[PDB]
Amino acid sequence: DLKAFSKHIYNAYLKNFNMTKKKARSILTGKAPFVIHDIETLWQAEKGLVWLPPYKEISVHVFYRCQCTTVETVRELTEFAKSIPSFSSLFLNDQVTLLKYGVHEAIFAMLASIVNKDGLLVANGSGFVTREFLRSLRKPFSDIIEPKFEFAVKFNALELDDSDLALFIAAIILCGDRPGLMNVPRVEAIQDTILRALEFHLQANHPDAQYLFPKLLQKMADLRQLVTEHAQMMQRIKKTETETSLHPLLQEIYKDMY
Amino acid sequence: VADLKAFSKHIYNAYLKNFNMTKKKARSILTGAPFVIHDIETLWQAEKGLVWLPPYKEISVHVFYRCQCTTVETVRELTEFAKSIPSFSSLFLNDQVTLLKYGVHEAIFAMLASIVNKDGLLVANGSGFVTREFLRSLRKPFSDIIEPKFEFAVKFNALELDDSDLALFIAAIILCGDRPGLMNVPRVEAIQDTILRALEFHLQANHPDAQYLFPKLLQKMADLRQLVTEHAQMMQRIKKTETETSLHPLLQEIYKD
Numbered sequence: 001d002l003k004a005f006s007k008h009i010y011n012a013y014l015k016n017f018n019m020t021k022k023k024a025r026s027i028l029t030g031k032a033p034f035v036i037h038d039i040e041t042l043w044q045a046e047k048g049l050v051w052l053p054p055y056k057e058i059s060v061h062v063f064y065r066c067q068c069t070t071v072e073t074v075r076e077l078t079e080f081a082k083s084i085p086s087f088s089s090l091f092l093n094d095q096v097t098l099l100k101y102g103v104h105e106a107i108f109a110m111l112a113s114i115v116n117k118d119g120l121l122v123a124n125g126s127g128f129v130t131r132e133f134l135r136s137l138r139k140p141f142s143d144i145i146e147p148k149f150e151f152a153v154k155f156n157a158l159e160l161d162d163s164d165l166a167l168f169i170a171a172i173i174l175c176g177d178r179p180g181l182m183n184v185p186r187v188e189a190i191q192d193t194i195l196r197a198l199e200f201h202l203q204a205n206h207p208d209a210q211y212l213f214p215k216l217l218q219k220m221a222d223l224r225q226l227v228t229e230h231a232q233m234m235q236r237i238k239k240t241e242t243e244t245s246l247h248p249l250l251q252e253i254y255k256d257m258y
Numbered sequence: 259v260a261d262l263k264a265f266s267k268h269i270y271n272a273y274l275k276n277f278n279m280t281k282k283k284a285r286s287i288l289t290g291a292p293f294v295i296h297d298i299e300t301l302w303q304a305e306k307g308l309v310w311l312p313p314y315k316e317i318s319v320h321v322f323y324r325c326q327c328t329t330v331e332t333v334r335e336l337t338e339f340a341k342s343i344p345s346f347s348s349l350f351l352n353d354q355v356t357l358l359k360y361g362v363h364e365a366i367f368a369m370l371a372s373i374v375n376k377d378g379l380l381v382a383n384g385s386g387f388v389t390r391e392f393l394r395s396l397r398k399p400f401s402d403i404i405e406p407k408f409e410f411a412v413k414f415n416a417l418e419l420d421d422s423d424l425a426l427f428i429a430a431i432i433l434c435g436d437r438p439g440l441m442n443v444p445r446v447e448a449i450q451d452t453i454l455r456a457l458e459f460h461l462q463a464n465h466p467d468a469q470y471l472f473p474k475l476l477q478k479m480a481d482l483r484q485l486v487t488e489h490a491q492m493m494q495r496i497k498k499t500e501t502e503t504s505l506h507p508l509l510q511e512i513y514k515d
């Protein structure tokens with residue numbers, strides 16, 4: 001039962017996410033991606049090497065590429081969630097509420113799978129943008145990038161695998177205290193099942209890991225704080241960068257966050 | 259032209275797959291038997307097992323609660339119907355909820371005509387029939403919301419649509435481009451235009467002698483928006499003046515501004 005619950009989550013994870021942490025770790029080690037570290041390498045990458053509103057500047061273009069990856073990951077998270085036991089049994093408005101307040105927590109957790117202390121895989125791992133180059137971007141666009149590296153480095157130290165992350169992201173999405181949730185008891189019930197499955201799974205998968213389950217619970221609290229700060233940065237970019245576009249899907253997500 | 263016939267058939271199959279009651283099944287029941295509910299005693303009989311919730315209050319509120327129940331179940335079926343429609347599922351989930359939020363009541367009142375005649379209304383999968391006169395005898399403001407639906411339904415049933423017609427008509431109601439807060443307006447308008455073209459084509463083949471049928475149905479869509487507007491006003495009065503009466507949570511989200 002509880003193994004069948006976890007296996008179903010793991011299969012929905014492998015089915016709906018093109019880039020897994022296993023595939024990504026093979027690329028980042030050497031089992032090669034074009035390194036993007038300045039304007040010239042980025043232009044070459046955008047000229048067919050690796051791969052939107054009109055080109056404004058270098059920092060805004062990268063900002064636009066960040067939005068694009070979010071839109072694509074929301075599509076995958078929506079299909080992943082719809083393959084979760086009794087997520088589809090929720091009314092559609094509750095499904096949207098869980099995705100609205102959960103996608104960025106899940107996105108920032110899954111970014112760790114394609115991130116190291118030096119940079120980030122882009123476009124199915126065919127490219128690799130460096131942390132140094134992303135730091136060099138203009139403000140406020142550089143402000144939204146570095147905190148994700150800091151979280152991802154410490155999160156990768158826990159050495160979770162795809163089977164772990166499948167339950168971890170499922171627990172992020174099915175969160176009982178999202179604002180405006182209609183059927184809170186049902187969501188809390190599903191969440192409690194996922195957390196039990198997660199603890200059960202971590203026992204077999206990481207028998208030597210000390211305090212791993214409460215460590216992951218703390219990571220979930222960290223992710224909510226990371227998203228709150230990110231949402232405030234995004235709202236200031238919306239205020240101060242009036243010529244910079246925001247994808248309509250992201251506009252609906254950040255509308256009421258404070 | 260060739261894609262339209264297949265597009266229509268796919269929508270009809272989604273109709274037959276997801277709705278508990280069709281107009282074909284309903285009209286055969288209404289012509290010959292359902293237990294007739296016409297007063298308090300028959301209604302109690304129906305609840306005790308002959309035919310079939312928040313805590314009881316009174317008879318008019320109990321019928322009001324059963325009205326909410328049929329809406330909740332029809333929203334479930336309309337959501338599965340819409341999800342089987344071409345390119346509805348391709349919209350982001352928040353656009354799907356917006357279309358359903360502002361469309362389900364227009365579609366519900368259109369589909370209500372299938373189980374209504376001038377004398378009353380089928381209930382509980384057609385095993386019951388509640389009379390129009392009994393529903394009229396309920397306490398205001400609860401009897402206020404019932405009678406205009408009969409009035410719309412009898413005039414709507416005069417058009418003599420069948421289920422294949424209604425499948426496209428319901429799809430056009432849901433895929434409405436001017437719903438408040440719609441994100442991808444051009445994509446919804448494009449899907450609606452395809453449905454309206456499929457509907458026009460379908461009406462020519464299925465009702466070859468029917469005059470002005472397609473613009474009549476477009477007018478019915480406008481009538482349905484006015485019917486829902488007046489209904490929401492009446493629901494606001496019930497929410498204001500009947501404070502002891504509960505409103506199902508799904509309906510609170512639909513009627514929230």
Ligand SMILES: CCCOc1ccc(C[C@H](CC)C(=O)O)cc1CNC(=O)c1ccc(C(F)(F)F)cc1
Binds near residue numbers: 070
């Ligand atoms: C791990 C470093 C931080 O990355 C991110 C930080 C924040 C967000 C949240 C978004 C921001 C709009 C949201 O609010 O939705 C997303 C990312 C993901 N970035 C990318 O995938 C990316 C970056 C650069 C390139 C390029 F090649 F162009 F350089 C291509 C892809």
Ligand SMILES: CCCOc1ccc(C[C@H](CC)C(=O)O)cc1CNC(=O)c1ccc(C(F)(F)F)cc1
Binds near residue numbers: 379509
């Ligand atoms: C054609 C008559 C009008 O019916 C309706 C009017 C308005 C709405 C919209 C709702 C109102 C809360 C909403 O706002 O969502 C729904 C219905 C559907 N009624 C029923 O199916 C029904 C009625 C009575 C019984 C009983 F036998 F118990 F008496 C059982 C079922």
Ligand SMILES: CCCCCCCO[C@@H]1O[C@H](CO)[C@@H](O)[C@H](O)[C@H]1O
Binds near residue numbers: 508
């Ligand atoms: C089952 C589909 C039909 C559901 C219709 C009800 C939709 O309600 C709306 O759901 C949204 C959350 O997604 C909220 O943001 C809105 O405030 C709310 O009004």
Ligand SMILES: CCCCCCCO[C@@H]1O[C@H](CO)[C@@H](O)[C@H](O)[C@H]1O
Binds near residue numbers: 252
């Ligand atoms: C693609 C799934 C994840 C996207 C989440 C986007 C959430 O947007 C919300 O959609 C609701 C209608 O559904 C509106 O009522 C809210 O105002 C809006 O904030």
